[PDB]
């Protein structure tokens with residue numbers, strides 16, 4: 001179960017965050033033990049497509065090779081806080097699992113600048129018991145977390161030392177698919 005009401009960044013700049021470009025997860029913190037593997041790869045694109053606020057996701061388990069993409073229209077709860085009903089798609093946007101009630105994630109941007117961000121997400125998917133997940137993002141897939149975002153982790157009363165890095169997993173991403181999925 002999720003337990004955190006994450007606070008969105010004061011003065012969050014939505015148009016800059018949702019500019020159509022890609023964000024890579026560089027580090028993550030799952031609050032519930034064993035909710036996720038200790039080696040993982042994830043990235044997203046975020047943008048407005050034909051007037052609609054969208055995110056495209058990519059997940060890859062570098063050990064098992066499990067791979068999946070998603071696309072969602074985000075609904076607004078407040079500035080920087082969204083609810084996203086997701087559909088599983090192949091890389092070309094063909095639907096594998098349709099949107100359905102009870103399949104949604106929340107998404108809160110706690111900190112962002114042009115190059116880095118800190119987000120919280122809570123996944124709801126059928127009768128799974130999933131918990132809070134924080135992620136440090138960067139525009140550059142190889143970037144070590146800088147002082148702005150690490151200070152934001154501290155300001156959220158979290159310990160960056162607990163976050164797990166994705167950088168040692170040989171992660172390679174299809175940025176073209178993520179961008180094009182925004183339209184799907």
Ligand code: HEM
Pocket residue numbers: 025028035036037039040041042043044057059068069070086087088097104105107119121123125128133135
């Ligand atoms: C931007 C950050 C993230 C968002 C918005 C997000 C969202 C989601 C969504 C929507 C699903 C379900 C997809 C589907 O069934 O179609 C999912 C599944 C999953 N995510 Fe993430 N995720 C993010 C990052 C991560 C990270 C960093 C990990 C670390 C391992 C992770 C681990 C998983 C796992 C293991 C599943 C499979 C759950 C299951 O069905 O048992 N995610 N995520």
Ligand SMILES: [N+]
Pocket residue numbers: 123133
């Ligand atoms: N997740």
